[PDB]
Design an enzyme around this catalytic site. Structure first.
Site, short mmCIF file in Angstrom:
data_model
loop_
_atom_site.label_atom_id
_atom_site.label_comp_id
_atom_site.label_asym_id
_atom_site.label_seq_id
_atom_site.Cartn_x
_atom_site.Cartn_y
_atom_site.Cartn_z
N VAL F 47 37.80 36.51 33.55
CA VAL F 47 38.01 37.36 34.69
C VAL F 47 39.36 38.08 34.57
CG1 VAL F 47 38.68 37.10 37.14
CG2 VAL F 47 36.35 36.40 36.31
N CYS F 48 39.33 39.39 34.80
CA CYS F 48 40.51 40.25 34.75
C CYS F 48 41.60 39.75 35.74
CB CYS F 48 40.07 41.70 35.06
SG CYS F 48 38.79 41.79 36.41
N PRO F 49 42.88 39.72 35.30
CA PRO F 49 43.98 39.26 36.19
C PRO F 49 44.53 40.30 37.22
CG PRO F 49 44.78 39.62 33.92
CD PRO F 49 43.32 39.93 33.90
#
Lengths: 167, 167, 170, 170, 170, 170, 169, 169, 167, 167
Positions: F47-49
């Site tokens: 998942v993208c931060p």
């Protein structure tokens, strides 16, 4: 301590040396006969083992009154075996006709109230157990003083006499 | 068990055999030097004592890196003495340059977490203690498998190297 | 039991009959001497008091090795005195040379681990206490079997010999 | 610690990185084989992972004696995978042949007695488990000193030899 | 104490001397009769045994009103037998018609709240127990002072009377 | 949890990565400023931060209202450093202006009531702590949903405003 | 119970009717004298109180041997006074020379071990307390059966005799 | 507190003012829908209740995404009704589309961890509960600072989005 | 501690009462089906006029015409209650009375109604309204010097019966 | 559990009250030197006419001419008390009132006076007479449906003040 006069002597089992071989031995192997069960402090000390030898040499006198004799220390069965295999002249026990029970875990000494927690072995304790497994006598000596075969035979004879005839 | 990595190794004292004499020995007699403190199961068994002999024969290699070696079983100092005085050929240890500490009361084995309550002796345990008395390594083997002098020397050398140079 | 080999024998004090008189007797009264301290089950039984009489009749054998003997049961000092005042030929004790200590409350028997809760009296317990008040020996017998004066003397002698000279033999 | 020589090694299960994939891995998955189960302190440190790489690079030496190796730290399976995906020449682990088990919750480290409460990671613990799930060996090292593949192989061989033949020598 | 007015007298059993012989005696052996159960401190003391003899000589007065008497002390039955066998002239009790019960364990005395922990014997305690085993009366006297047979007879007849007729006086 | 609105925020200390290096950081290092202290579950996931980067890029907005931001997860500081050193393109965080605090022992997370015992990491928890160390606001989100920088700014300005002027609206 | 033979008798205090007046009374007021301290169940019942009456009527046999008598029940001092002020011939006690102590809270009865929790009053308990305040004798009777003044006198005389001479024979 | 993210939200029940009528309301009445469950400190205070008003006025933005709103304070249902029946311009709340739940016993506030033992009312706590009754979000504010409808909407939409698609990017 | 709780069953009580100059066992549940005014007064035979009891006695038909009974209680024995009743008023007695005087000799009833003064051994002035279902509806506790009003008690009973029926 | 005991100091209380349309901190001990009638009522703004409070309000000069104050209390907040006062009677409000309305929002005061109904969240109808020394003299506890009488309360206060002085 679990040893009480007039009560079943506490159960024990371990490895003994009997005629130079390892044998599993149980207190209850002696049911049907009187037993002199005694403790001594250690194998291989600088003090002659007069008492074990004395009991060994006089075994047929116990046997002719239906009595066995077992000796016990906190030493391993391997140490007992080596002690027996060391000749008397070199500081050893030599051949002996009395089983040497090992109390390596110390459980047996503790149950019999003879274990010296500060020292790691027992005092000189002797116990007379009758043919029903009941504890009839307790003798505890401080270490420097041994037991007498004659006193032990008197006690065994007396308990056997009173078992049959009373008083 | 009181033995914890990075904590002072637990204190012990007892009677050892050192060059054929009884000596009072304390863990803390070794402060200022690394110590390889190890336990073995019993004197006088039917299994050759290769590991004790191996450590004995190779003692100067420990000594040249400021390291002492002490061996320990639950046997009496009297049994250790007799074992040393039995020649290797008869099933004995023979002369040895490594102190044999007696853990007769079992306190020491319990503190080090090596005591077999069902058996009455220890497993094969080895401990590397640094010059500040701090426990750096613990090796515990099930009984049938011994220790290696070379592995022990690597570990001692590595802990000494990292004490000085880091990483 | 508070009785432990190698430790100060448990303190006791009570009324004893000593030469037909009631005296307060304490364990520490024996400091500086060995003490054979033994319990016996009851006064006035139908079984000959052979074992108590033996100790009193042979008392000089103890005294010539700086040792005293005190006997004890759970009986009152009054029962002790009445037993002593009954002639041996009537089954009584007769005059006796050793104190008979009364342990009426049972405290001393309990401290010595010789009290039988179900019977209300003690077994046959004997205790050798050195001249420093330290317990050296415990002999406990089931009711039907008595103690030996000869064995007791051997033990006392052995403890004094090793007190002074130590190890038995090479 | 639940880890006791001669007893079933404590059960564990978790997510491991195995050949760049997340897999659920359990101790009992290794039944029928010896298992070298070791802990190491942390992914992505500045100190070369020489000791973990040694085990993976030499894995066929274990496999040819029916033994598997699983490494473990308190790091997440995501950190494991990122470490593996970093090339050795950058200080990463590089591709590796042994599962990297994640002990993120710390339960397994605690059951093995290798967890350091004050640091939040484990020391260097290694465990040899036989093919019956029994623990045979525990090696615990302070942080600065690594394990030897050679020593570990000697131990595994010795345990299999004595499993089949018993006593070492006359 | 377990002794409570209007509750079943605390059960007891032991060895009593009855007509010069040992007998097992139980509180329940008396169901159907009133029982005067009294404790006295000790056999063979220097104080004259007036009260036991008075109960003894006057026994028939209790028997004619369906009442038994049993005396008790902490002495053994053997001491009880010797005391009976000692002529009144030398300090004995002489022949006696009431049982002397032995409370050697001190249990019966504790149950009746008559035991003196510091002396090892009882004070002077007396109990009136009816034909249904119910405790009706407790008299406890400090050591120096005895009991009166007449007073004991008045209480027994009073209880039997009110048992049958309830009423005292309008 | 020890985190209670209107009480001093629970003390914490640990190693943080700040401008690409390890620093000891303490809650008390922030006395005199407002602090946005937030937890996120794990470094290096798929998942993208987005949320950490948003806080990072917008840091100056907090700094101009005397507010610092500190992020935290259960990862070690070494993993935090590697994640920062990984280009955003390969799944990294890239250069970042906010400290990444390590809660490797899980203590700080437990103290703030954000730890998930079954997963070994935190949920998404955010805390507004004023210049006097007092906890003013708690936001806890289940895993899938992030935090908004604008909402966080609204709460911070709201607290500073009511700190100075008390009143909301008549 | 706190009453133990050979030990100080449990302290008590309260209101008594003495001479048709309410007075505060304490066990310690009796030091220097023997005390017969006795509990009876209830004022105003249907059975003749001949047992309290008997002690009052023979009071001089106690006083001539330095002994006082105090009677006690769980009734209030007001009830004691009403009982006293009601003539014998009418269910009352009439005038009486012995103090009637009220144990209204039941504390004194409980301390002496004479309280019956299920009925709320005492059994027939009598206590002999010497001039040093030591309890010497306890007499407890089931409800249906009264005490004897003669036996109490015999007991007091015997304690006093043995206090001084110690030795029956 | 019994409120734990990812676990069923603590059960509650009580009397609410719904539509100017007293009705029994339960957490379970909301199964099948998202629930914004929010606590506010007190009816009838001197500060504009623009935060409850704001939720009521924008209620359709919740309902069009299958979400209900319930407001709760420790006041009694009678007080809630009085507040509703008092016009905005006068200190009152005026008519409102969201249920006002009474937590008069304080049990619900304590279960949600929002009760202030020293003041006797709640802080500003908001809870987001999904259609399966699972707690998804907890927002707790110190007294001086209100909630935003926009942020609540963003949160509900985000939970519903991830419920179905699971994956930001 | 007190067991008397408004809206719960009044605590059970049983004892001896004096009713029309005779002893009768009386219990709370004898009153089920009727309202009960149950009140405590401190003691019989004090020097203070028994105004309130007489007042309830004299006005008993007012209670009975509203299906209500009255029972008075103190810690005095039933024997004292009978003597107090049988003592003419002018002599300090109660005189004939048409409410039951219940004896709480053991004090348990007083304690269960939370009216017992443990330092004095009697109760304060306590009054209880219990409805026809055995439910405690009203508790009135007065310090010693101040008595209860029959008019207030009547008002309270009629009020409870009114709201029982009409809300 | 209740701390209210007749003859002991009334349990301490403090809170916000509405007094002459304003908020003031109020505590029990503000009343020392004066008698206090302190009573609980269940709730503001119910559909049942507030007859009793109005009654005490209207008759306040009767209390004050006997050195007695009256304070009313419910679990409602001080904000609700103010709204209830500021709501005209004809609209269901209390209207202007000259007794303090104390807020027991935390419920501790209700619990200390043993009047809180834990299943409902408000109190029953409880009234307490406390003298000028802070001593609790009278406790009156009424089930919900039935109110207190101003006349009875006056009678009880004058009776306590009378016996304070004359016995």
């Amino acid at each position: 301590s679990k040893a009480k006069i007039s009560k079943p002597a506490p159960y024990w089992e371990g490895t003994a040396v009997i005629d130079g071989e390892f044998k599993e031995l149980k207190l209850t192997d002696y049911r049907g006969k009187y037993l002199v069960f005694f403790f001594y402090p250690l194998d291989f000390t600088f003090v002659c083992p007069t008492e074990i030898i004395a009991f060994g040499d006089r075994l047929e006198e116990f046997r002719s009154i239906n009595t066995e004799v077992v000796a016990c220390s906190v030493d391993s069965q391997f140490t007992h075996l080596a002690w027996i295999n060391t000749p008397r002249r070199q500081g050893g026990l030599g051949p002996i006709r009395i089983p040497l029970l090992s109390d390596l875990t110390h459980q047996i000494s503790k149950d019999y109230g003879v274990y010296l927690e500060d020292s790691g072995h027992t005092l000189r304790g002797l116990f007379i157990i009758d043919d029903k497994g009941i504890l009839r006598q307790i003798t505890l000596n401080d270490l420097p003083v041994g037991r007498s075969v004659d006193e032990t035979l008197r006690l065994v004879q007396a308990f056997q006499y009173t078992d049959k005839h009373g008083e």
